[model samples]
Target: QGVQKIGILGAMREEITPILELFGVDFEEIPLGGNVFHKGVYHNKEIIVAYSKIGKVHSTLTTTSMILAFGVQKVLFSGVAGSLVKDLKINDLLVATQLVQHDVDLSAFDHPLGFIPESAIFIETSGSLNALAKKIANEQHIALKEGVIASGDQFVHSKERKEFLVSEFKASAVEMEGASVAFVCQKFGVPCCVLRSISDNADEKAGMSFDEFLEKSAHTSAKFLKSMVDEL
Candidate 1:
């Protein structure tokens, strides 16, 4: 096993459904607050999986518990993100190279878009984990791309907002919880990486396309996550 114990997360039930059934049935369920942690064995290695509901706050809470209580050595997160660029079409897989909270702004203090007081504006994902994802991607012929991802509380449906993230942070995709999860794992000094599949283009049609492709897009990311774990 590459790692003795690891923690996995998804932002919604649709995103985590594949992981819940990854090992084919037997798992220990532990309820904490609103999140349920499932203890499952993958290649004889322990893996704790859960869905963090949605948004940054939920991600922070669940990831903190996973690190402090579960004591996982690494964290793997999979979900869907709206594409900010045209080259990344719907259902295309992506491994986060770095993440930023797009909603954070302290410009009055002459700070940038992701600038938070006393913390890093850009949160980087684990390089080793991302390399592993790329290896699996090529072997599996999944066409997984590694790029910057933006996280925020709002569902980005406007073209102006989507372009802003791209212009400001060079984010290729935008989602709700990845940056927060990365930030938490960084604080605990645990290896972490985020996997995402494009659900929609962040435009006027995003709202409808997101709902339509939610489950389908999540499939690509979830499958990628399992493959990465299988390698370990």
Candidate 2:
């Protein structure tokens, strides 16, 4: 069939529920070796999606497998992220334009300017996809802010770390999976877009706010995504 097969991946079950509910899609929880494959059909379209643990390697492997094993055409990563830039507040939405691994450093090897020898760094989403996402967001009455998303294993708890990422990397948001998913999708010649909901400001108030605000954020992003799909 020439139908478009869209894939959606998230890191946690809480993150996945809202999307599934919004699409009116029933997902069969397939417990795989590493990640659980959530199979569903929505809007007369077939979808095969999953999310792995929170890390670069986990996301890379999960997304790559989604491409290679399931033959998905386009992939969307919808989940929570940290607010790096001050303009973006908690519960706001961000569309990833570029992704950076701020922690990667192999400058000692002097391979090239600001280069990491083995560590994968600086993966960007496709421009075409980003543009399309912008169009969808505009139509859906949702403010989809576009910016650079940074990924690292460390959960940034310090103001200094947040400032460094903002000033040096120009990162607007921080998440563990976006860059990794973008990397695999780009390598496989598939369109990818990372849609992140800012769960916390990465400040002293983050812990309290995250616990209280995630459900609302999840609903907002999920509804936006559902409306987007309907329009498409």
Candidate 3:
């Protein structure tokens, strides 16, 4: 490895471990209250890992630190999301080619949809890295789909709300963290990849199916992250 570093960030520490287990070296885990950041050095290659709390601000702070403090070259985000599009069934893995914050609105200021004044509507992920991720998914025989992920602060469950998001944003899934990470990473000129698993459809079936399917979805995301490290 020519580079001495790699970085992984998630919304939960449990999500971070699956990625760490794939590394053939030891790592230093730093407690981050609800989230954690770990530093791992392997064969002289350093990997900084962290996950923030369950919202946009948490993601912003965690990502900013990873870039400013650890000087991470690239960042990969792994977590769960609500499926807005019908195609993404529970446990399905989604590799975000693009991400948007659907909830951001400033209509009073006459801002555009998915607009946050200074923030852009959509953020692009690294094509080469995303291509590599697809390769890994194919090799592992994982049910991987590529699409745009919508990020927001609320847990959308109402049918009307879900319909509005789908019709308005045209996003495949909704999550709490991806777009914020993309925003910060982009600002620092660091490439970021957002990988998510559909934990549940944000619909009437949400509560009933979410917990029942959460472990499976989380495990899917974990395995996907591990395979990405191995294959990449």
Task: Tell me model 3's lDDT, rounded to 2 decimals.
Answer: 0.79
Ten-residue region with minimum lDDT total, candidate 1: 18-27
* Predicted model with the maximum lDDT: 1
> What's each prediction's TM-score?
0.97, 0.90, 0.90
True-vs-predicted CA distance for residue 103, candidate 3, Å? 1.2
Alpha-carbon local distance difference test for all models = 0.91, 0.78, 0.79
- Model 3 misplacement above 4 A: 22-25, 31-35
Residue 181 accuracy (lDDT) in model 3: 92
For lDDT, candidate 1 versus 2, the one ahead is 1
Better of 1 and 3 by TM-score: 1
Q: Which candidate is the best by TM-score?
A: 1
- The alpha-carbon lDDT assigned to residue 230 of candidate 1 equals 86
TM-score of 3: 0.90
- Model 2 residue 206 CA deviation (Å) reads 2.0
